[PDB]
Amino acid sequence: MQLLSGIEQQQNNLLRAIEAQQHLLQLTVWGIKQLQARGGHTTWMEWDREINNYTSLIHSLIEESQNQQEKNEQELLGG
Amino acid sequence: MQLLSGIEQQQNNLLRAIEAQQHLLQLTVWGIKQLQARGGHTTWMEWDREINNYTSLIHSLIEESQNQQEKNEQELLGG
Amino acid sequence: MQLLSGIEQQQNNLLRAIEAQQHLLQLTVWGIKQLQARGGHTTWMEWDREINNYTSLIHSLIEESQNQQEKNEQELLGG
């Protein structure tokens, strides 16, 4: 159970990173639509905050995925 | 065969989502180049349609990846 | 060892593609911030070069991930 659990669990990390990256894509699509339609300083500050919130989350999911890769490989070698 | 098939098959779903997200990236890169070069209402309507077409596809691939994760985990537990 | 090695190794390819796509996201976020703040021809040429450098890398990682999927599936079938 132990090794296949680590493999399936890393597949969820990669999926979570894909989901988080997809939301970051919608934020970039939103920004392109605003500029094409053209001011709102308060709105663009919130946009910057959400870009950072999801950037920090993606890097956390990338780090967690890197940590699981090392554990899955450690388990494969000599197990 | 059954469990490793479900694992390999979910790796293809994640890859398909990465491929679909990559094409959505080129659409956002295209939009940034248009604004930097500056009108074309018909062209930006087609751009919005392709943003939605690939957004709907990515969510379909994310949902399919979530469905396979549950099936792979169900199979691991008690199998 | 052979099959699970190919599965774990493809998980690293997908993670490398996610990492490369994430850097391409920051380049698109950078471009949106420049236009919102508004000229710099030399800077936008370097931006285009880095968009292509990471686009070429992502497609290389997508191709490598597609090559590993076929090898993992070949190994599963009749092994």
Residue numbers in the entry:
A (entry chain A), B (entry chain A), C (entry chain A): 542 to 579, 623 to 663
Task: List sentences from the manuscript.
Entry of human immunodeficiency virus type 1 (HIV-1) into target cells involves fusion of viral and cellular membranes, a process mediated by the viral surface protein Env (gp160). Ultimately, the extended state collapses into its most stable form, a trimer-of-hairpins (TOH), in which the C-HR regions pack in an antiparallel manner into hydrophobic grooves on the outside of the N-HR coiled coil. The thermostable core of the gp41 TOH consists of the three-stranded N-HR coiled coil surrounded by three helical C-HR segments.
Residue 549 (in an e-position of the N-HR hydrophobic heptad repeat) extends directly into the N-HR/C-HR interface where it fills a small hydrophobic pocket bounded by side chains of Asn656, Glu657 and Leu660 and the backbone of the C-HR helix. The V549E substitution did not disrupt the continuity of the N40 coiled coil nor C37 docking on its surface. Symmetry dictated that the three C37 peptides bind the V549E-mutant coiled coil with equal affinity, which will be lower than that for the wild type coiled coil due to disrupted hydrophobic packing. Hence, asymmetry is not a general feature of escape from C37-like fusion inhibitors, but rather a special property of the Q552R substitution.
